[PDB]
Structure formats: structure tokens, C-alpha cells
Design a protein around this ligand. Sequence first.
Ligand SMILES: Nc1ncnc2c1ncn2[C@@H]1O[C@H](COP(=O)(O)OP(=O)(O)O)[C@@H](O)[C@H]1O
Ligand code: BEF
Lengths: 49, 49
Amino acid sequence: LLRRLKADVEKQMPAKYEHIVYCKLSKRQRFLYDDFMSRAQTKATLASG
Amino acid sequence: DVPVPSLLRGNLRTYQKQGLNWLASLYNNHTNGILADEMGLGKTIQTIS
Ligand SMILES: Nc1ncnc2c1ncn2[C@@H]1O[C@H](COP(=O)(O)OP(=O)(O)O)[C@@H](O)[C@H]1O
Ligand code: BEF
């Protein structure tokens, strides 16, 4: 193997931030989501299949 | 590591030169290994070198 990371070349590399942006589901997406959940329960969700 | 640079015309940094340093033990000893370096550190420059 040969492995190196940015820590050796660091302090010249700028910062890296991971943001998390939350977006609420829309109205028709809330209706369609629950619709697919119920219709999926009619198929027994196919979880163990 | 005693590299002869000729036809290197581009410029390489120190840790990549160490990449060729650790690459010198492969072909000279007839050994094959995986070189995995952090993305953005220019492995291709090491291969071309
Ligand atoms: N000596 C150097 N000086 C400046 N930039 C370099 C040098 N060596 C490599 N790079 C940059 O690093 C990048 C390396 O990309 P590449 O080797 O194709 O994939 P990766 O490095 O992610 O494996 C190139 O886009 C190049 O601009
Ligand atoms: F590892 Be680099 F992104 F090719």
C-alpha cells in the first residue's frame, strides 16, 4: 500500500464545512407520500420479501 | 530516491516527490502495489514522473 492524506499538506488547504439544509415536504408530496405508504401497506410493504 | 528529472518540465511538490521516492521501490524490486493517495494530491503527476 501507499497512503497519504491532506493533513501533511494541510494549513495551506482552506476549510471544509458540511452544512445540512432542511426542507419541509410540499403539500402534494405529503399527500402522495402517505398515499404510497398506504398503497404499500396494501402490498404488505414488501419489507421481508 | 535519486531521480533524474529530465523531461519533467512541470513542477512537483515535496510530498509528490516522496511519491516517486516510494514508487522507486516498486519497479526496481519488481514489486507491484496499490498507490492510494488523497484525492487532489496529484497521483497522476507521480505516475507521469
Ligand atoms: N506540482 C503541482 N503544482 C500545482 N498543481 C498541481 C501539481 N501537481 C498536481 N496538481 C494539481 O492536482 C490535480 C491532480 O488531479 P489528478 O491527479 O488527475 O487526480 P487526483 O489528484 O485526484 O488523483 C491536477 O488538477 C493539478 O492541477
Ligand atoms: F484522486 Be484524484 F481525484 F484523481
